[PDB]
Amino acid sequence: QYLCQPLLDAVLANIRSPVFNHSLYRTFVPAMTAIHGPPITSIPSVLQGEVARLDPKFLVNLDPSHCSNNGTVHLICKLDDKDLPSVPPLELSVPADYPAQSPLWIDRQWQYDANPFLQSVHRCMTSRLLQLPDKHSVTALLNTWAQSVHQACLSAA
Amino acid sequence: METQLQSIFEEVVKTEVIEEAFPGMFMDTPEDEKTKLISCLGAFRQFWGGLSQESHEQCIQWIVKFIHGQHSPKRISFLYDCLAMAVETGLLPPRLVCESLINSDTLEWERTQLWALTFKLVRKIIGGVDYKGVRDLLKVILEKILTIPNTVSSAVVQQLLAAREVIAYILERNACLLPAYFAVTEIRKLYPEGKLPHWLLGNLVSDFVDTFRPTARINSICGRCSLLPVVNNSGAICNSWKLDPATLRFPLKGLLPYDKDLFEPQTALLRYVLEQPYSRDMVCNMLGLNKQHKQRCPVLEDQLVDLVVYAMERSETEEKFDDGGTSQLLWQHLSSQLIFFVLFQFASFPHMVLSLHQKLAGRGLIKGRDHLMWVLLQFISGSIQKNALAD
Amino acid sequence: WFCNNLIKELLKETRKEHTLRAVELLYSIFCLDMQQVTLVLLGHILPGLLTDSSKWHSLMDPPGTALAKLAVWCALSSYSSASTRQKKRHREDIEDYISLFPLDVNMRDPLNRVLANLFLLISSILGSRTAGPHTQFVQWFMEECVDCLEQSVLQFMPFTTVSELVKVSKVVLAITDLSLPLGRQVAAKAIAAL
Structure with missing residues (x-):
């Protein structure tokens, strides 16, 4: 910073030299070692952390069909609630690298037929899921699937 | 908007x-x-x-x-x-x-x-x-x-x-x-x-593509590869006999699946043409060259070598059933038109030198040697000052 | 040496009829010693047709299908089972087939050995991910195994490969079940996954 440019200029002059480690040795070694003293004497862990704090009211497990040990995964959900009636079990679709991507869900229109209650459930699904934000976790979709059953049961009752 | x-x-x-x-x-x-x-x-x-x-x-x-x-x-x-x-x-x-x-x-x-x-x-x-x-x-x-x-x-x-x-x-x-x-x-x-x-x-x-197999059979001509014309000096070259000068095939209409025999080089047609004398006008027609334009076709120098080495075996087999063996006339023919080919310089000489050196390396058939330098002498004597000694 | 000369020359074709004539001629040429080409095609050629990655780029729609038909013509005929010189040259030679192929009806007959070994290679191709022309070749493999079969030539099917065909996506699933009494329940399981 002030009066150190001989030390700075010596190393740039002595750089790209093969005798560098020996030139510095020859010019420097006896000065410090004399006075100052002598020398001394399967599944990724993302889903494993995801399912850890999932609700016990879901019993989601893997799909028995489709491919396995690959990038894309599918989880079929089980709902055991005494409050809510029976519905189709629903199945998701999550590709590889589950963080920072937006997954999908299967489509089967005829499974929710023979009852306008199931059609209202499907319409509520198309209402709630279309405004869900990007890159969200599976808890948001699971809970929006869970609340719509009560939201349709109150209209049915 | x-x-x-x-x-x-x-x-x-x-x-x-x-x-x-x-x-x-x-x-x-x-x-x-x-x-x-x-x-x-x-x-x-x-x-x-x-x-x-x-x-x-x-x-x-x-x-x-x-x-x-x-x-x-x-x-x-x-x-x-x-x-x-x-x-x-x-x-x-x-x-x-x-x-x-x-x-x-x-x-x-x-x-x-x-x-x-x-x-x-x-x-x-x-x-x-x-x-x-x-x-x-x-x-x-x-x-x-x-x-x-x-x-x-x-x-x-x-x-x-x-x-x-x-x-x-x-x-x-x-x-x-x-x-x-x-x-x-x-x-x-x-x-x-x-x-x-x-x-x-x-x-x-x-x-x-296989369903287009009969269609080319419509355009198929039987024995087209074996057909050959006659060499004449009358002009008006028949365009059916003409080939592609770049890669030695017949021109084709469309991209139909033609047979295999239409895809090989037809060296036989130019072989028969150049083996006969007076192959002067239609050799430029079948190669599409006007003969005043400098092109320097490299592969055109190949068959000129391939005839000359062929001229070795016609001078090597017997050459004793006849006194001339029907060869010295063909040696004169080779001396005549091959130097006319390099007169327009479409065949560069040291390339033929190295190709003959490569070709004769391995066979060692030396019987008709007396012609080999002599026509070479016909190159050296008539072209003494037009080039340097690098060739 | 002869098979190696002709196999590389098989890779010049793009027209299906044009290669199929050569395959039909090679069927008789291989039928000259069918008892040996049924064991050397499946022995070192087919492993040599799949070991590297780029080598199945030749295995395409004309030549792969033609070679698959060529193999299935010879295989059945060897299951069914032409010169004195063939009897002469087959006398002296002995060969350790277990040293060549340790296997990872009889299981000592090379007809029962090498043919059963090939199904392990087909399972290795199909179970391997990153699908390419090799998957096309193994899907062309057994699609003609039933075409000539009016109604066992496929007795040596491993049990794991039954579920694989529906994993790569019919009636050939029921054909591969062999209609065994023990195969009855796994046949029902396989057709349940449809």
Whole structure:
């Protein structure tokens, strides 16, 4: 910073030299070692952390069909609630690298037929899921699937 | 225009930010699959009303790049259902919107859900495409298929298999959207004979070319390769006998699957022509050269070597059944026209020197040696000052 | 040496009829010593057709299908089972087939050995991910195994490969079940996954 440019200029002059480690040795070694003293004497862990704090009211497990040990995964959900009636079990679709991507869900229109209650459930699904934000976790979709059953049961009752 | 539709698409595709916080409390459903689409198509059609003919397409070029700008694939499917009925109303033709999806770079071989949705949609809107549009789309689909490498991970293979059945439906001649005569031309342009196509094409195209097998049989001429003309000096060269000077084949009409014998070099025709005397005018005709233009054809120097080494064995086998062996006349012929070939300098001398050095290395057949330097002397004596000693 | 000369020359074709004539001629040429080409095609040639990655780029729609038909013509005929010189040259030679192929009806007959070994290679191709022309070749493999079969030539099917065909996506699933009494329940399980 002030009066150190001989030390700075010596190393740039002595750089790209093969005798560098020996030139510095020859010019420097006896000065410090004399006075100052002598020398001394399967599944990724993302889903494993995801399912850890999932609700016990879901019993989601893997799909028995489709491919396995690959990038894309599918989880079929089980709902055991005494409050809510029976519905189709629903199945998701999550590709590889589950963080920072937006997954999908299967489509089967005829499974929710023979009852306008199931059609209202499907319409509520198309209402709630279309405004869900990007890159969200599976808890948001699971809970929006869970609340719509009560939201349709109150209209049915 | 662009800004008003910017605002409209912004308020249509938005997943609201304050939504999903303190959630599930409103007693109000959003606009469903019909009402939201009606609301968006109203603004779309009033924007289209003040849209000129040239500005119809370019906003479409933005629309897809906004749709490809989206990231929720359920929202993408909702937009696909929007555009499925938007082109049904006649506001957008299903001829100009098909290539708008593919033209975006976002449709690569990694957005496989987008790939499946796009190919299903263009399968659905295929009805409003003429023969010219079908021909335009098949080639870009083919090169897009060619962009995929040979081996890609099989997690998304069935997402990519849809194009195979799409092309198979397109290739169906019973529907007859486009004649197969135009369909085979692009495939043959990309994949000629002896050229392997991409592995994604499947057996169907290999069958599709096979149905053109009788057609070339219509154009097949029996024993055409064995037919030869006569060498004359009368002019008016017959164009049927003419070949391709660059690679020694007959010219062909179209890209039909011709037989194998039409694809080899016909060295025999020029062999018979040059073996006979007075092969002066039609040798330029069959090679297409006007003889005043400096071309310096390298392969043309090959057969001139190949005759000369052949001239070795006619001077090597016996040369004793006759006093001249019917060779010194042919030696005079070789001395006459070979120096006329280098008179226009279409055959560079040290290349023949090195080629003869390579050819004679290995055989060692030295019997007719006396001719070999003598005609070489005919090169040295007559061309003493026109060149240096490097040759 | 002779098979190696002709196999590389098989890779010049793009016309299906043009290669199929050569394959039909090679069927009789291999039928001259069918008892040996049924064991050397499946022995070192087919492993040599799949070991590297780029080598199946030749295995395409004309030549792969033609070679698959060529193999299935010879295989059945060897299951069914032409010169004095062939009797002469087959006398002196002895060979350790277990040293060549340790296997990872009889299981000592090379007809029962090498043919059963090939199904392990087909399982290795199909179970391997990153699908390419090799998957096309193994899907062309057994699609003609039932075409000539009016109604065991496929007795040596391993049990794990039954579920694989529906994993890569009909009636050939029921054909591969062999209609065994023990195969009855796994046949029902396989057709349940449809």
